[model samples]
Target: EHAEINIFSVASGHLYERMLNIMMASVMHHTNHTVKFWFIEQFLSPSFKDFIPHMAAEYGFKYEMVTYKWPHWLRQQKEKQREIWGYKILFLDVLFPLSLDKVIFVDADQIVRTDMYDLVEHPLDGAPYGFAPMCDSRVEMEGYRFWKTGYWANYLKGKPYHISALYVVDLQRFRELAAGDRLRQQYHALSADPNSLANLDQDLPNHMQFTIPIATLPQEWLWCETWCSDETLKDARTIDLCNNPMTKEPKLDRARRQVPEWTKYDEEIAELARRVRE
Candidate 1:
Protein backbone atom coordinates (compact mmCIF):
# COMPACT_ATOMS: atom_id res chain seq x y z
CA GLU A 1 0.00 0.00 0.00
CA HIS A 2 2.94 2.30 0.60
CA ALA A 3 4.80 2.60 -2.69
CA GLU A 4 5.03 6.31 -3.44
CA ILE A 5 8.18 8.21 -2.42
CA ASN A 6 9.69 11.65 -2.84
CA ILE A 7 13.43 12.33 -2.37
CA PHE A 8 14.25 16.01 -1.89
CA SER A 9 17.50 17.97 -2.35
CA VAL A 10 18.05 21.66 -2.98
CA ALA A 11 21.08 22.72 -5.01
CA SER A 12 22.36 26.11 -6.09
CA GLY A 13 24.95 25.47 -8.84
CA HIS A 14 28.18 23.93 -7.61
CA LEU A 15 26.17 21.46 -5.56
CA TYR A 16 23.95 20.68 -8.54
CA GLU A 17 26.46 18.23 -9.99
CA ARG A 18 27.31 15.97 -7.03
CA MET A 19 23.76 16.23 -5.74
CA LEU A 20 22.37 14.66 -8.89
CA ASN A 21 24.60 11.66 -8.40
CA ILE A 22 23.49 11.25 -4.81
CA MET A 23 19.82 11.45 -5.79
CA MET A 24 20.28 8.93 -8.58
CA ALA A 25 21.92 6.48 -6.23
CA SER A 26 18.92 6.93 -3.95
CA VAL A 27 16.48 5.93 -6.68
CA MET A 28 18.51 2.90 -7.81
CA HIS A 29 18.91 1.54 -4.34
CA HIS A 30 15.20 1.45 -3.76
CA THR A 31 12.93 -1.15 -5.42
CA ASN A 32 9.34 -1.68 -6.53
CA HIS A 33 8.33 1.91 -5.95
CA THR A 34 7.50 5.18 -7.61
CA VAL A 35 10.15 7.80 -6.79
CA LYS A 36 10.16 11.53 -7.51
CA PHE A 37 13.36 13.55 -7.24
CA TRP A 38 12.63 17.09 -6.10
CA PHE A 39 15.20 19.78 -6.79
CA ILE A 40 15.03 23.29 -5.44
CA GLU A 41 17.14 25.61 -7.50
CA GLN A 42 17.43 29.40 -7.67
CA PHE A 43 17.85 29.51 -11.42
CA LEU A 44 16.67 27.05 -14.08
CA SER A 45 18.34 26.50 -17.42
CA PRO A 46 17.90 24.29 -20.45
CA SER A 47 21.09 22.52 -19.43
CA PHE A 48 19.48 21.45 -16.18
CA LYS A 49 16.39 20.05 -17.86
CA ASP A 50 18.33 18.28 -20.61
CA PHE A 51 20.12 16.04 -18.13
CA ILE A 52 17.01 14.37 -16.73
CA PRO A 53 17.24 11.24 -18.84
CA HIS A 54 20.74 10.47 -17.61
CA MET A 55 19.53 10.48 -14.03
CA ALA A 56 16.37 8.69 -15.08
CA ALA A 57 18.34 5.89 -16.69
CA GLU A 58 21.15 5.77 -14.17
CA TYR A 59 19.01 5.46 -11.04
CA GLY A 60 15.53 5.17 -12.46
CA PHE A 61 14.83 8.53 -10.87
CA LYS A 62 12.27 11.23 -11.66
CA TYR A 63 12.83 14.99 -11.52
CA GLU A 64 10.98 18.13 -10.52
CA MET A 65 12.86 21.43 -10.30
CA VAL A 66 11.45 24.38 -8.43
CA THR A 67 12.59 27.66 -9.89
CA TYR A 68 12.15 31.01 -8.23
CA LYS A 69 13.38 34.52 -8.91
CA TRP A 70 13.88 36.57 -5.77
CA PRO A 71 16.25 39.44 -5.26
CA HIS A 72 18.90 39.42 -2.53
CA TRP A 73 17.04 42.08 -0.57
CA LEU A 74 13.89 39.99 -0.67
CA ARG A 75 16.10 37.14 0.42
CA GLN A 76 16.95 38.14 3.96
CA GLN A 77 19.91 36.47 5.61
CA LYS A 78 17.29 34.88 7.79
CA GLU A 79 15.31 34.22 4.64
CA LYS A 80 18.21 32.22 3.31
CA GLN A 81 17.79 30.10 6.38
CA ARG A 82 14.06 30.13 5.76
CA GLU A 83 14.54 28.90 2.20
CA ILE A 84 16.50 25.90 3.46
CA TRP A 85 14.28 25.65 6.47
CA GLY A 86 11.30 25.73 4.17
CA TYR A 87 12.88 23.22 1.85
CA LYS A 88 12.78 20.85 4.80
CA ILE A 89 10.25 22.57 7.01
CA LEU A 90 7.59 23.69 4.55
CA PHE A 91 7.90 20.52 2.50
CA LEU A 92 6.80 18.69 5.60
CA ASP A 93 4.63 21.55 6.86
CA VAL A 94 2.66 21.88 3.65
CA LEU A 95 2.43 18.19 2.86
CA PHE A 96 -0.60 17.61 5.01
CA PRO A 97 -2.54 20.08 2.89
CA LEU A 98 -2.28 17.35 0.25
CA SER A 99 -2.89 14.59 2.79
CA LEU A 100 0.75 13.48 2.93
CA ASP A 101 1.50 13.02 6.60
CA LYS A 102 5.09 11.88 6.46
CA VAL A 103 8.28 12.22 4.42
CA ILE A 104 12.05 11.43 4.47
CA PHE A 105 14.73 14.06 3.70
CA VAL A 106 18.20 13.14 2.44
CA ASP A 107 21.05 15.62 2.27
CA ALA A 108 22.79 16.12 -1.08
CA ASP A 109 26.05 14.67 0.24
CA GLN A 110 24.75 11.15 0.90
CA ILE A 111 24.16 7.89 -0.97
CA VAL A 112 21.44 5.33 -0.47
CA ARG A 113 21.91 1.56 -0.49
CA THR A 114 18.56 0.16 0.69
CA ASP A 115 14.86 0.43 -0.04
CA MET A 116 13.50 3.68 1.34
CA TYR A 117 10.04 2.18 1.17
CA ASP A 118 11.03 0.13 4.19
CA LEU A 119 12.01 3.38 5.91
CA VAL A 120 8.63 4.89 5.09
CA GLU A 121 6.83 1.90 6.56
CA HIS A 122 7.96 2.73 10.07
CA PRO A 123 5.40 4.32 12.41
CA LEU A 124 5.77 7.98 13.48
CA ASP A 125 4.99 7.20 17.16
CA GLY A 126 2.94 10.40 17.68
CA ALA A 127 6.07 12.52 17.45
CA PRO A 128 6.51 15.32 14.91
CA TYR A 129 9.19 13.24 13.11
CA GLY A 130 11.84 10.54 13.11
CA PHE A 131 15.57 11.02 12.50
CA ALA A 132 18.95 9.61 13.33
CA PRO A 133 20.64 11.08 16.35
CA MET A 134 22.83 13.98 15.31
CA CYS A 135 26.37 12.80 15.81
CA ASP A 136 25.22 11.62 19.25
CA SER A 137 28.51 12.63 20.74
CA ARG A 138 28.07 16.20 19.54
CA VAL A 139 24.76 16.58 21.29
CA GLU A 140 26.01 14.72 24.35
CA MET A 141 29.06 16.92 24.70
CA GLU A 142 27.12 20.11 24.00
CA GLY A 143 24.47 19.16 26.54
CA TYR A 144 27.08 18.38 29.15
CA ARG A 145 29.08 21.53 28.47
CA PHE A 146 26.02 23.78 28.61
CA TRP A 147 24.96 22.21 31.90
CA LYS A 148 28.43 22.70 33.30
CA THR A 149 28.48 26.37 32.19
CA GLY A 150 25.06 27.07 33.79
CA TYR A 151 24.36 29.48 30.91
CA TRP A 152 21.59 27.58 29.15
CA ALA A 153 20.81 25.45 32.17
CA ASN A 154 17.04 25.51 31.91
CA TYR A 155 17.03 24.32 28.30
CA LEU A 156 19.74 21.80 29.08
CA LYS A 157 17.92 20.28 32.03
CA GLY A 158 16.63 16.77 31.35
CA LYS A 159 17.07 17.62 27.70
CA PRO A 160 18.46 15.24 25.12
CA TYR A 161 19.50 16.65 21.75
CA HIS A 162 18.33 14.64 18.73
CA ILE A 163 19.38 15.61 15.21
CA SER A 164 16.28 16.10 13.07
CA ALA A 165 17.72 16.25 9.57
CA LEU A 166 17.44 12.77 8.08
CA TYR A 167 14.36 10.77 8.95
CA VAL A 168 10.61 10.52 8.44
CA VAL A 169 8.75 13.63 9.61
CA ASP A 170 5.09 14.21 10.44
CA LEU A 171 4.24 17.19 8.27
CA GLN A 172 1.05 18.28 9.98
CA ARG A 173 2.53 18.58 13.44
CA PHE A 174 5.59 20.54 12.32
CA ARG A 175 3.50 23.13 10.47
CA GLU A 176 1.94 24.29 13.69
CA LEU A 177 5.28 24.47 15.44
CA ALA A 178 6.93 26.53 12.70
CA ALA A 179 3.98 28.83 12.17
CA GLY A 180 4.56 32.58 11.97
CA ASP A 181 2.05 33.29 14.71
CA ARG A 182 3.83 30.94 17.08
CA LEU A 183 7.18 32.50 16.23
CA ARG A 184 5.92 36.04 16.80
CA GLN A 185 4.32 35.04 20.06
CA GLN A 186 7.62 33.64 21.25
CA TYR A 187 9.43 36.77 20.06
CA HIS A 188 7.40 39.16 22.19
CA ALA A 189 6.59 36.96 25.16
CA LEU A 190 9.42 34.51 25.65
CA SER A 191 12.29 36.85 24.86
CA ALA A 192 12.84 39.87 27.07
CA ASP A 193 15.01 41.22 24.25
CA PRO A 194 14.62 41.35 20.49
CA ASN A 195 17.54 39.10 19.64
CA SER A 196 17.24 36.45 22.30
CA LEU A 197 18.68 33.56 20.32
CA ALA A 198 19.74 35.85 17.43
CA ASN A 199 18.76 33.02 15.09
CA LEU A 200 15.97 30.54 15.62
CA ASP A 201 17.59 27.81 13.52
CA GLN A 202 19.91 26.06 15.96
CA ASP A 203 18.43 26.99 19.29
CA LEU A 204 14.88 26.23 18.17
CA PRO A 205 15.72 22.76 16.95
CA ASN A 206 17.60 21.89 20.13
CA HIS A 207 14.63 23.13 22.11
CA MET A 208 12.33 21.02 19.97
CA GLN A 209 14.46 17.93 20.50
CA PHE A 210 14.30 18.32 24.25
CA THR A 211 10.61 19.13 24.46
CA ILE A 212 8.51 17.86 21.54
CA PRO A 213 10.19 14.46 21.10
CA ILE A 214 11.23 12.59 17.93
CA ALA A 215 11.78 8.95 16.95
CA THR A 216 15.33 7.71 16.53
CA LEU A 217 16.49 5.80 13.50
CA PRO A 218 18.60 2.74 14.24
CA GLN A 219 22.37 3.24 14.64
CA GLU A 220 23.03 0.94 11.69
CA TRP A 221 20.84 3.16 9.51
CA LEU A 222 22.46 6.52 10.32
CA TRP A 223 26.24 6.12 10.42
CA CYS A 224 27.26 9.78 10.72
CA GLU A 225 30.59 10.45 9.02
CA THR A 226 31.99 12.97 11.52
CA TRP A 227 32.28 10.14 14.03
CA CYS A 228 32.21 7.08 11.78
CA SER A 229 34.63 4.44 10.51
CA ASP A 230 34.76 1.62 7.95
CA GLU A 231 33.60 -0.80 10.62
CA THR A 232 30.71 1.52 11.44
CA LEU A 233 29.43 1.30 7.87
CA LYS A 234 28.50 -2.39 7.86
CA ASP A 235 24.80 -3.15 7.32
CA ALA A 236 24.05 0.57 7.12
CA ARG A 237 20.71 1.33 5.52
CA THR A 238 21.91 4.79 4.49
CA ILE A 239 25.43 6.21 4.65
CA ASP A 240 25.94 9.93 5.14
CA LEU A 241 29.11 10.42 3.09
CA CYS A 242 29.17 13.85 4.69
CA ASN A 243 32.57 12.99 6.08
CA ASN A 244 33.35 9.78 4.20
CA PRO A 245 36.99 10.42 3.42
CA MET A 246 37.64 13.00 6.13
CA THR A 247 38.81 16.28 4.68
CA LYS A 248 41.49 18.50 6.15
CA GLU A 249 42.83 21.76 4.59
CA PRO A 250 43.21 22.16 0.85
CA LYS A 251 40.64 20.50 -1.44
CA LEU A 252 43.27 18.62 -3.50
CA ASP A 253 44.77 16.25 -0.94
CA ARG A 254 42.52 16.66 2.07
CA ALA A 255 40.06 14.20 0.50
CA ARG A 256 40.45 10.55 1.14
CA ARG A 257 43.05 8.98 -1.07
CA GLN A 258 41.45 7.07 -3.91
CA VAL A 259 41.27 3.54 -2.66
CA PRO A 260 40.47 0.60 -4.91
CA GLU A 261 37.07 0.18 -3.27
CA TRP A 262 35.92 3.82 -3.58
CA THR A 263 36.94 3.82 -7.23
CA LYS A 264 33.61 2.25 -8.08
CA TYR A 265 31.75 5.06 -6.38
CA ASP A 266 33.93 7.60 -8.10
CA GLU A 267 33.45 5.93 -11.49
CA GLU A 268 29.70 5.75 -11.04
CA ILE A 269 29.46 9.41 -10.04
CA ALA A 270 31.60 10.44 -12.98
CA GLU A 271 29.51 8.47 -15.43
CA LEU A 272 26.37 9.99 -13.97
CA ALA A 273 27.87 13.46 -14.37
CA ARG A 274 28.84 12.78 -17.97
CA ARG A 275 25.29 11.84 -18.82
CA VAL A 276 23.96 14.77 -16.83
CA ARG A 277 26.22 17.11 -18.81
CA GLU A 278 25.27 15.57 -22.13
Candidate 2:
Protein backbone atom coordinates (compact mmCIF):
# COMPACT_ATOMS: atom_id res chain seq x y z
CA GLU A 1 0.00 0.00 0.00
CA HIS A 2 1.24 3.49 -0.87
CA ALA A 3 1.45 5.67 2.20
CA GLU A 4 3.33 8.55 0.56
CA ILE A 5 4.17 10.02 -2.82
CA ASN A 6 6.35 13.09 -3.48
CA ILE A 7 6.15 15.31 -6.56
CA PHE A 8 8.22 18.34 -7.51
CA SER A 9 7.16 21.09 -9.92
CA VAL A 10 7.55 24.84 -10.58
CA ALA A 11 5.56 27.45 -12.47
CA SER A 12 5.30 31.22 -12.78
CA GLY A 13 2.58 33.52 -14.17
CA HIS A 14 -1.16 33.13 -13.51
CA LEU A 15 -1.87 30.77 -16.42
CA TYR A 16 0.73 28.19 -15.40
CA GLU A 17 -0.35 28.50 -11.76
CA ARG A 18 -3.89 27.66 -12.81
CA MET A 19 -2.63 24.62 -14.70
CA LEU A 20 -0.58 23.64 -11.66
CA ASN A 21 -3.71 23.40 -9.50
CA ILE A 22 -5.42 21.23 -12.10
CA MET A 23 -2.37 18.99 -12.22
CA MET A 24 -2.54 18.56 -8.46
CA ALA A 25 -6.25 17.72 -8.60
CA SER A 26 -5.80 15.23 -11.40
CA VAL A 27 -3.10 13.49 -9.38
CA MET A 28 -5.32 13.42 -6.31
CA HIS A 29 -8.29 12.08 -8.27
CA HIS A 30 -6.43 8.99 -9.44
CA THR A 31 -4.29 8.07 -6.44
CA ASN A 32 -5.23 7.37 -2.84
CA HIS A 33 -1.64 7.78 -1.68
CA THR A 34 -0.55 10.40 0.79
CA VAL A 35 0.70 13.10 -1.60
CA LYS A 36 3.19 15.88 -0.99
CA PHE A 37 4.45 18.59 -3.33
CA TRP A 38 7.66 20.55 -3.51
CA PHE A 39 7.32 23.97 -5.15
CA ILE A 40 10.07 26.35 -6.15
CA GLU A 41 9.65 29.24 -3.70
CA GLN A 42 11.08 32.05 -5.78
CA PHE A 43 8.66 31.55 -8.70
CA LEU A 44 5.42 31.32 -6.64
CA SER A 45 3.08 34.29 -6.40
CA PRO A 46 1.75 35.51 -3.05
CA SER A 47 -1.86 34.64 -3.96
CA PHE A 48 -0.95 30.98 -4.73
CA LYS A 49 1.30 30.72 -1.68
CA ASP A 50 -1.81 31.74 0.28
CA PHE A 51 -4.31 29.66 -1.76
CA ILE A 52 -2.49 26.31 -1.44
CA PRO A 53 -3.01 25.72 2.31
CA HIS A 54 -6.79 25.78 1.81
CA MET A 55 -6.50 23.39 -1.11
CA ALA A 56 -4.22 21.11 0.91
CA ALA A 57 -6.79 20.91 3.71
CA GLU A 58 -9.68 20.24 1.33
CA TYR A 59 -7.77 17.70 -0.76
CA GLY A 60 -5.69 16.26 2.10
CA PHE A 61 -2.28 16.54 0.47
CA LYS A 62 0.87 18.32 1.73
CA TYR A 63 3.17 20.84 0.04
CA GLU A 64 6.36 22.69 0.88
CA MET A 65 7.98 25.65 -0.88
CA VAL A 66 11.74 25.26 -1.20
CA THR A 67 14.57 27.51 -2.40
CA TYR A 68 18.29 27.01 -3.02
CA LYS A 69 20.61 29.89 -3.77
CA TRP A 70 22.48 29.79 -7.07
CA PRO A 71 26.13 28.97 -6.53
CA HIS A 72 28.53 31.81 -7.27
CA TRP A 73 30.80 29.76 -9.47
CA LEU A 74 28.17 28.64 -12.00
CA ARG A 75 27.46 30.92 -14.96
CA GLN A 76 24.09 32.64 -14.78
CA GLN A 77 21.30 33.26 -17.22
CA LYS A 78 19.83 36.75 -17.42
CA GLU A 79 16.17 35.89 -18.03
CA LYS A 80 13.81 34.72 -15.28
CA GLN A 81 12.41 31.86 -17.35
CA ARG A 82 15.92 30.60 -18.08
CA GLU A 83 16.74 30.82 -14.41
CA ILE A 84 13.65 28.78 -13.59
CA TRP A 85 14.72 26.11 -16.07
CA GLY A 86 18.21 26.26 -14.63
CA TYR A 87 16.97 25.50 -11.14
CA LYS A 88 14.85 22.61 -12.38
CA ILE A 89 17.87 20.58 -13.47
CA LEU A 90 20.79 22.21 -11.68
CA PHE A 91 20.08 22.01 -7.97
CA LEU A 92 18.18 18.75 -7.58
CA ASP A 93 20.74 17.24 -5.21
CA VAL A 94 20.67 19.98 -2.59
CA LEU A 95 17.09 21.29 -2.92
CA PHE A 96 15.44 18.76 -0.62
CA PRO A 97 16.15 17.21 2.77
CA LEU A 98 18.71 14.41 2.81
CA SER A 99 16.27 11.87 4.16
CA LEU A 100 14.04 11.96 1.05
CA ASP A 101 14.93 8.85 -0.95
CA LYS A 102 12.95 9.44 -4.15
CA VAL A 103 10.78 12.00 -5.94
CA ILE A 104 9.19 12.58 -9.32
CA PHE A 105 9.16 15.87 -11.21
CA VAL A 106 6.05 16.57 -13.24
CA ASP A 107 5.43 19.60 -15.43
CA ALA A 108 2.87 22.10 -14.15
CA ASP A 109 0.78 21.72 -17.32
CA GLN A 110 0.46 17.93 -17.13
CA ILE A 111 -2.64 15.86 -16.25
CA VAL A 112 -2.54 12.46 -14.62
CA ARG A 113 -4.71 9.49 -15.59
CA THR A 114 -3.08 6.87 -13.30
CA ASP A 115 -1.70 6.55 -9.80
CA MET A 116 1.86 7.91 -9.75
CA TYR A 117 2.82 5.85 -6.72
CA ASP A 118 3.81 3.27 -9.35
CA LEU A 119 6.38 5.71 -10.69
CA VAL A 120 7.58 6.52 -7.21
CA GLU A 121 8.46 2.85 -6.78
CA HIS A 122 9.81 2.34 -10.29
CA PRO A 123 13.47 1.31 -10.43
CA LEU A 124 16.12 3.33 -12.27
CA ASP A 125 18.23 0.36 -13.54
CA GLY A 126 21.30 1.59 -11.65
CA ALA A 127 20.95 4.98 -13.33
CA PRO A 128 20.47 8.12 -11.24
CA TYR A 129 17.32 9.28 -13.07
CA GLY A 130 14.54 8.25 -15.43
CA PHE A 131 12.84 10.26 -18.21
CA ALA A 132 10.30 9.48 -20.87
CA PRO A 133 11.77 9.56 -24.33
CA MET A 134 10.26 11.89 -26.93
CA CYS A 135 7.47 10.30 -28.95
CA ASP A 136 8.37 9.47 -32.53
CA SER A 137 4.82 8.46 -33.45
CA ARG A 138 3.69 11.76 -34.90
CA VAL A 139 5.08 11.85 -38.41
CA GLU A 140 3.84 15.34 -39.17
CA MET A 141 6.11 17.05 -36.66
CA GLU A 142 9.17 15.24 -37.95
CA GLY A 143 10.33 18.36 -39.73
CA TYR A 144 10.77 20.22 -36.48
CA ARG A 145 12.49 17.36 -34.71
CA PHE A 146 15.77 19.15 -34.19
CA TRP A 147 17.33 16.32 -32.28
CA LYS A 148 17.09 14.00 -35.27
CA THR A 149 20.02 15.66 -36.97
CA GLY A 150 22.99 17.96 -36.40
CA TYR A 151 24.67 18.28 -33.02
CA TRP A 152 21.99 16.46 -31.07
CA ALA A 153 21.84 13.58 -33.51
CA ASN A 154 25.61 13.44 -33.58
CA TYR A 155 25.77 13.27 -29.81
CA LEU A 156 22.91 10.84 -29.36
CA LYS A 157 24.03 8.60 -32.24
CA GLY A 158 20.68 6.84 -32.33
CA LYS A 159 19.82 7.19 -28.63
CA PRO A 160 16.40 8.52 -27.78
CA TYR A 161 16.24 12.16 -26.69
CA HIS A 162 14.33 12.02 -23.41
CA ILE A 163 11.79 14.71 -22.62
CA SER A 164 12.29 16.63 -19.40
CA ALA A 165 8.54 17.20 -18.91
CA LEU A 166 8.38 14.18 -16.60
CA TYR A 167 11.23 12.53 -14.72
CA VAL A 168 12.06 10.45 -11.65
CA VAL A 169 15.18 11.04 -9.61
CA ASP A 170 16.48 8.40 -7.24
CA LEU A 171 17.93 10.92 -4.83
CA GLN A 172 20.23 8.26 -3.40
CA ARG A 173 21.66 7.36 -6.81
CA PHE A 174 21.77 11.02 -7.87
CA ARG A 175 23.82 12.20 -4.90
CA GLU A 176 25.98 9.10 -5.04
CA LEU A 177 26.78 9.93 -8.66
CA ALA A 178 27.38 13.58 -7.76
CA ALA A 179 24.99 14.46 -10.59
CA GLY A 180 24.38 17.97 -9.30
CA ASP A 181 28.06 18.80 -9.37
CA ARG A 182 28.55 17.05 -12.70
CA LEU A 183 25.70 19.02 -14.23
CA ARG A 184 26.79 22.37 -12.77
CA GLN A 185 30.30 21.98 -14.12
CA GLN A 186 28.88 21.26 -17.57
CA TYR A 187 26.36 24.11 -17.24
CA HIS A 188 29.20 26.40 -16.26
CA ALA A 189 31.14 25.37 -19.37
CA LEU A 190 28.22 25.76 -21.80
CA SER A 191 26.19 28.66 -20.34
CA ALA A 192 29.01 31.18 -20.87
CA ASP A 193 28.44 30.86 -24.65
CA PRO A 194 24.90 32.42 -24.57
CA ASN A 195 23.61 29.98 -27.20
CA SER A 196 24.19 26.87 -25.09
CA LEU A 197 21.75 24.98 -22.86
CA ALA A 198 18.93 26.11 -25.19
CA ASN A 199 16.59 23.99 -23.14
CA LEU A 200 18.50 23.93 -19.89
CA ASP A 201 16.57 21.24 -18.02
CA GLN A 202 16.13 18.92 -20.99
CA ASP A 203 19.38 19.59 -22.81
CA LEU A 204 21.80 19.15 -19.95
CA PRO A 205 20.60 15.69 -19.03
CA ASN A 206 20.42 14.47 -22.63
CA HIS A 207 23.92 15.80 -23.18
CA MET A 208 25.21 13.96 -20.17
CA GLN A 209 23.73 10.59 -21.10
CA PHE A 210 27.09 9.24 -22.20
CA THR A 211 28.60 9.59 -18.75
CA ILE A 212 25.37 9.67 -16.78
CA PRO A 213 23.00 7.08 -18.23
CA ILE A 214 19.29 7.88 -18.35
CA ALA A 215 16.79 5.14 -17.51
CA THR A 216 14.20 5.47 -20.25
CA LEU A 217 10.74 5.29 -18.77
CA PRO A 218 7.99 3.47 -20.63
CA GLN A 219 6.61 5.43 -23.59
CA GLU A 220 3.10 5.30 -22.16
CA TRP A 221 4.24 7.15 -19.03
CA LEU A 222 3.92 10.58 -20.73
CA TRP A 223 2.02 11.57 -23.88
CA CYS A 224 1.28 14.87 -25.57
CA GLU A 225 -1.24 15.57 -28.31
CA THR A 226 1.46 17.56 -30.03
CA TRP A 227 3.94 14.68 -30.29
CA CYS A 228 1.71 11.60 -30.14
CA SER A 229 -1.08 10.35 -32.37
CA ASP A 230 -4.71 9.86 -31.29
CA GLU A 231 -4.41 6.07 -31.19
CA THR A 232 -2.10 6.28 -28.21
CA LEU A 233 -4.39 8.50 -26.14
CA LYS A 234 -6.20 5.60 -24.52
CA ASP A 235 -3.00 4.36 -22.92
CA ALA A 236 -1.45 7.62 -21.70
CA ARG A 237 -0.59 7.69 -17.97
CA THR A 238 0.01 11.43 -17.92
CA ILE A 239 -0.98 13.83 -20.67
CA ASP A 240 1.26 16.87 -20.94
CA LEU A 241 0.04 19.96 -22.77
CA CYS A 242 2.99 20.57 -25.05
CA ASN A 243 2.82 23.65 -27.30
CA ASN A 244 1.85 23.18 -30.92
CA PRO A 245 4.20 25.23 -33.03
CA MET A 246 2.45 24.21 -36.23
CA THR A 247 -0.94 25.68 -35.23
CA LYS A 248 0.35 28.19 -32.67
CA GLU A 249 -2.66 27.47 -30.45
CA PRO A 250 -2.49 28.95 -26.97
CA LYS A 251 -2.19 26.46 -24.08
CA LEU A 252 -5.46 27.01 -22.20
CA ASP A 253 -7.44 26.56 -25.41
CA ARG A 254 -5.55 23.35 -26.11
CA ALA A 255 -6.03 22.10 -22.53
CA ARG A 256 -9.72 22.90 -22.74
CA ARG A 257 -9.97 20.94 -25.95
CA GLN A 258 -7.62 17.99 -25.31
CA VAL A 259 -8.55 17.02 -21.75
CA PRO A 260 -12.25 17.21 -20.92
CA GLU A 261 -11.63 16.17 -17.30
CA TRP A 262 -9.39 19.24 -16.97
CA THR A 263 -12.40 21.58 -16.95
CA LYS A 264 -14.08 19.58 -14.15
CA TYR A 265 -10.89 19.61 -12.08
CA ASP A 266 -10.63 23.39 -12.49
CA GLU A 267 -14.25 23.79 -11.39
CA GLU A 268 -13.61 21.71 -8.28
CA ILE A 269 -10.77 24.00 -7.22
CA ALA A 270 -12.78 27.09 -8.13
CA GLU A 271 -15.77 25.90 -6.08
CA LEU A 272 -13.54 25.09 -3.11
CA ALA A 273 -11.94 28.52 -3.22
CA ARG A 274 -15.40 30.11 -3.35
CA ARG A 275 -16.83 28.00 -0.49
CA VAL A 276 -13.84 28.74 1.75
CA ARG A 277 -14.61 32.48 1.56
CA GLU A 278 -17.44 32.13 4.12
Q: Which candidate ranks first by TM-score, i.e. highest?
A: 2
TM-score for all models, in order of appearance: 0.69, 0.98
Q: Write the per-residue lDDT of candidate 2 for residues 83-174, one digit (tens) a residue.
A: 99988899989998888888899999999999999998887789999999999899999987889989999889899999999999988999
Model 1 residue pairs with clashes: none
RMSD of 1: 5.2
Q: What is the C-alpha lDDT profile of model 1 across 124-201, one tens digit per residue? A: 676666776544433434433333345455666744444434566666665645642343344334345445544343
In model 2, the clashing pairs are none
User: CA lDDT of 85 in candidate 1?
Assistant: 48
Q: What's model 1's TM-score?
A: 0.69
Best by lDDT: 2
Which regions of candidate 1 are displaced past 4 Å? 1-3, 43-46, 67-75, 78-86, 95-99, 136-154, 172-203, 243-266, 272-278
Q: All models: lDDT?
A: 0.53, 0.91
Candidate 1, which ten residues in sequence have the lowest lDDT sum?
Answer: 251-260
